[PDB]
Nucleic acid binder design. Structure first.
Ligand SMILES: [Mg+2]
Ligand SMILES: [Mg+2]
Ligand SMILES: [Mg+2]
Ligand SMILES: [Mg+2]
Ligand SMILES: [Mg+2]
Ligand SMILES: [Mg+2]
Ligand SMILES: [Mg+2]
Ligand SMILES: [Mg+2]
Ligand SMILES: [Mg+2]
Ligand SMILES: [Mg+2]
Ligand SMILES: [Mg+2]
Ligand SMILES: [Mg+2]
Ligand SMILES: [Mg+2]
Ligand SMILES: [Mg+2]
Ligand SMILES: [Mg+2]
Ligand SMILES: [Mg+2]
Ligand SMILES: [Mg+2]
Ligand SMILES: [Mg+2]
Ligand SMILES: [Zn+2]
Lengths: 47, 115, 137, 176, 190, 76
RNA sequence: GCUUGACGAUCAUAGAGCGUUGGAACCACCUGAUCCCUUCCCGAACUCAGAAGUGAAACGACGCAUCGCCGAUGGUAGUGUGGGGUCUCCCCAUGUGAGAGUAGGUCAUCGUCAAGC
RNA sequence: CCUAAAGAGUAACGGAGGAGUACGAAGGUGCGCUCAGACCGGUCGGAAAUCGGUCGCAGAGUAUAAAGGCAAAAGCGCGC
């Protein structure tokens, strides 16, 4: 895993506008706000 | 598969060069669990001496690391002179001369037989 | 007439015509055939002349094959030209014929109609021919 | 992220669902190559330095630019000029990227109720063509440039398309 | 019927064979097969050429009488003069009751006149092949294979799979995944 | 005519045949490419010339994979 | 002698294809990337530290001629020497003798060393 | 290259093509790797760009004509 050429890879903060919060690594360093997530979409459920 | 047959194709040039030169070869086989060393006479046919981790004096549990290879390298040097052979050529058998193979060669140099 | 669409080389050496035709001596497609019994060479104008004289006599059904192809170019030196100064230009195309080669084949007609029609064709060819029938071996 | 779930329920349930006698022949996702063919920048070639950075942000792993294998001058190219950029992901980096593209942003583009299941090859490798790259986080709409159709490809230890689909039937994939 | 007389031949080579054909009216021949050492024989030219006029001369078993010894034999191959057309050589395959022999068998086209493609459509009949290669035990080797063209229309192709062979007879070429065409009906030339 | 050209011949081929006695430095084959390959006791020049490095006799053997033709020197 | 590894002999009668089977050891897949070493990115490959799991894949062993590959006997073609003809081509005496095809074979045979009985 | 007659050589105002250069790396060495093409799936290209998989065995390549060669590749890349 070659170093000193790749950026920081932190875990950030993923928060949805529907109230869903998931922890997953990314390259943002700041909390984000999701207008839509997996648990607030019809197509997965099938409406 | 592909891993082994790429290694055998990688080792061809050195082996044919040593048969052109008509010399004594030290061939090394490395596996994930053990390591092997042989002294093939001059033309691939006869084996003069050999040593490995499978002999009933090194089956202790750690046979796939560096210091395991250093023990067998010192051992093959002892058996080589018992057969009255020196001035050999090192065959890495397609493996990289970096790790367990490299430590094997150094013990042979320390053991007395000169490349 | 008949000639290759294109060739690797424009000219050829004269060569020699020896041996018998062990290959091409069977009736492979039709029921009756015209077979050469002497050696010579057909000039692709005798092949076309003998084909038209052969298909005209049938005029009602029947399938006809040609087993000879003229693929050998021959040169000719023009009149009032000395010897040398390079090889001549190609004038016509010819096919080498050895004894025992099948020239034409036909099926779908009676034995007598084929025998009459191959007689007309053989009168346009500069070599001896014969009439044969298809056999298993 | 997603490794913790694979060998807990996906691995044993597919062991029995496909009637696989041994353990290891269960289908498994091997690698993800993202890549994108920059058909443009042939006479311009001044977007490669930003495209590599654009693909940098959504991965966290440095990409490699590709070159022209042959000439075919009809497209005004020959060998030597860069045409494309690729990224390879394995082990934890590929899974932790997958969930972000599985459903953190994938439903968040415009449309579609899912992904078609007929775009498989004869062995079970799945590739998705995407018409846009603003889908992903880590890039804001203002600073982006002329948009590019970034691609996605999945490579699995599947012997056939249905086994690949069955493994992709799990992981909550938008299929139909 | 199918009986030949032959004598043992002990002089071999190009010169000896040419003197047989030129000065004695004989034909060199060979019998091999079964489980025996091959044997070289010689036989009359006017005797072999008389039997060859029979239609079932190659799909029939023949009683070969060499000296006084009688053995059962099938005609395998036949060398002919390329120009004059007479037989120069022939080789003979020994026949064993339980062993598959591979032979050429002629075809027979029946009721060609009542063909649907002929009377109504006015099309010609063309025989692409006139013999087929079979393989079977000697006890069920047919003298011919019969193919009918009653239910054949214009433009229709007859293949090897279409025709049916007697019981215990196999078509060789069909086994190798190659059903070459046998006959067809096509439009008139003019 | 526009054809009357040709180059001078090069006198290639086998110089010493199988069984002949050889000395070190003797030229055995003159070649374009390697129709024959250098066996034991035989060297190769930059124009693929085969020459004898030791004394003995020529052997000529077709062995190995690739069906190559080898020229070697053996002790009489 | 039976099984597995390493190195050779010989280069398809030894290859390919299809099927059955091998984990006690050996080998292979396998776990992780801290430490040597690495990716024109990726522990994919190379490398290191291993002992949870499997023989799935790979490899080996064993069966089958469908393909591939070998391949007679006899005849034919050509041909050195001497002599003839109807001499662009052939024939005779003597010596030599293919290629193709046919009957039919082939799922190899060995050597050195080290580990399990 | 053929003529040129299976060692070498061999003529014609015989049949066909090239040369009068290039390269400080296109040389040396160590290490590492295999092409063309086909098919399937995949965003603007769609027959052909980059990509993933299977087959493929040299039908690619070789600075430049043709012939003879090329797996220890003589083909391709990198450090010194
Ligand atoms: Mg190399
Ligand atoms: Mg002349
Ligand atoms: Mg011929
Ligand atoms: Mg003679
Ligand atoms: Mg000239
Ligand atoms: Mg000359
Ligand atoms: Mg010359
Ligand atoms: Mg040198
Ligand atoms: Mg013979
Ligand atoms: Mg032969
Ligand atoms: Mg053959
Ligand atoms: Mg010569
Ligand atoms: Mg000569
Ligand atoms: Mg002169
Ligand atoms: Mg000039
Ligand atoms: Mg070069
Ligand atoms: Mg060439
Ligand atoms: Mg190699
Ligand atoms: Zn939500």
């Amino acid at each position: 895993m070659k170093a000193d050429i790749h950026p920081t890879y932190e875990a950030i903060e993923a928060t949805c506008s529907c109230g869903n919060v998931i922890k997953t690594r990314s390259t943002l360093c700041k909390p984000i706000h999701l207008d839509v997530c997996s648990e607030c979409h019809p197509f997965y459920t099938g409406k | 598969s592909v891993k082994k047959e790429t290694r055998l194709r990688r080792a061809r040039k050195a082996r044919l060069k040593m048969r052109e030169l008509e010399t004594v070869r030290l061939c090394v086989y490395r596996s994930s669990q053990h390591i092997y060393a042989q002294v093939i006479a001059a033309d691939g046919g006869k084996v003069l001496a050999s040593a490995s981790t499978l002999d009933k004096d090194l089956r202790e549990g750690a046979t796939g690391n560096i210091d395991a290879a250093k023990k067998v390298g010192q051992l093959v040097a002892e058996r080589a002179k018992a057969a009255g052979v020196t001035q050999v050529a090192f065959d890495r058998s397609g493996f990289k001369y970096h790790g367990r193979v490299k430590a094997l060669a150094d013990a042979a140099r320390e053991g007395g037989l000169e490349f | 007439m008949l000639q290759p669409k294109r060739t690797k080389f424009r000219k050829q050496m004269t060569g020699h015509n020896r041996g018998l035709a062990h290959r091409g001596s069977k009736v492979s497609f039709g029921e009756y055939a015209l077979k050469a019994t002497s050696r010579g060479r057909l000039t692709a104008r005798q092949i076309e002349s003998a084909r038209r004289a052969l298909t005209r006599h049938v005029k009602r059904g029947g399938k006809i094959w040609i087993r000879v192809f003229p693929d050998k170019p021959v040169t000719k030196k023009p009149l009032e030209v000395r010897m040398g100064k390079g090889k001549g230009g190609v004038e016509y195309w010819v096919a080498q014929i050895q004894p025992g080669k099948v020239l034409y084949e036909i099926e779908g007609v009676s034995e007598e109609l084929a025998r009459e029609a191959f007689a007309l064709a053989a009168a346009k060819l500069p070599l001896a021919t014969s009439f044969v029938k298809r056999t298993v071996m | 992220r997603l490794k913790e779930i694979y060998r807990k329920e996906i691995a044993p349930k597919l062991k029995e669902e496909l009637q696989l006698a041994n353990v290891m022949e269960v289908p498994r996702v091997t690698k993800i190559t993202l890549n994108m063919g920059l058909g443009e920048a042939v006479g311009d070639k001044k977007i490669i330095e930003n495209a590599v950075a654009d693909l940098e942000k959504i991965t966290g792993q440095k990409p490699v630019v590709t070159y022209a294998r042959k000439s075919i001058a009809g497209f005004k190219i020959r060998e030597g000029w860069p045409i494309g950029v690729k990224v390879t992901l394995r082990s934890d980096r590929m899974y932790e990227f997958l969930d972000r593209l599985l459903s953190i942003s994938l439903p968040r583009v415009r449309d579609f109720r899912g992904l078609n299941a007929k775009s498989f090859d004869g062995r079970g490798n799945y590739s998705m063509g995407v018409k846009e790259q603003i889908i992903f986080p880590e890039i804001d709409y203002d600073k982006i440039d002329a948009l590019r159709g970034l691609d996605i490809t999945l490579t699995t230890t599947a012997r056939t398309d249905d086994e690949g689909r069955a493994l992709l039937r799990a992981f909550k994939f938008p299929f139909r | 019927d199918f009986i030949l007389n032959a004598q043992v031949r002990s002089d071999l080579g190009k010169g000896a064979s040419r003197r047989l054909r030129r000065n004695a009216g004989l034909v060199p021949a060979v019998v091999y097969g079964g489980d025996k050492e091959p044997q070289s024989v010689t036989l009359e030219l006017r005797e072999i050429a008389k039997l060859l006029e029979n239609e079932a001369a190659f799909s029939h078993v023949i009683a070969l009488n060499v000296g006084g010894a009688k053995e059962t034999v099938l005609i395998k191959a036949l060398q002919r003069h390329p120009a004059k057309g007479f037989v120069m050589h022939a080789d003979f395959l020994r026949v064993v009751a339980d062993h598959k022999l591979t032979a050429h068998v002629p075809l027979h086209f029946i009721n060609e006149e009542v063909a649907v493609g002929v009377k109504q459509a006015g099309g010609e009949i063309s025989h692409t092949i006139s013999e087929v290669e079979v393989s079977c035990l000697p006890k069920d080797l047919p003298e011919f294979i019969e193919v009918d063209m009653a239910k054949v229309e214009l433009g229709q192709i007859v293949h090897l799979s279409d025709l049916k062979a007697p019981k215990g007879v196999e078509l060789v070429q069909l086994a190798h995944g190659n059903d070459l065409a046998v006959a067809n009906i096509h439009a008139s030339r003019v | 005519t526009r054809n009357g050209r040709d180059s001078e011949s090069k006198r290639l081929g086998v110089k010493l045949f199988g069984g002949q006695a050889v000395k070190a430095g003797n030229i055995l084959v003159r070649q374009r490419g390697t129709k024959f390959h250098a066996g034991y006791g035989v060297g190769l020049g930059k124009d693929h010339t085969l020459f004898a490095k030791v004394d003995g006799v020529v052997k000529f053997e077709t062995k190995g994979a690739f069906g190559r033709k080898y020229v070697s020197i053996v002790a009489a």
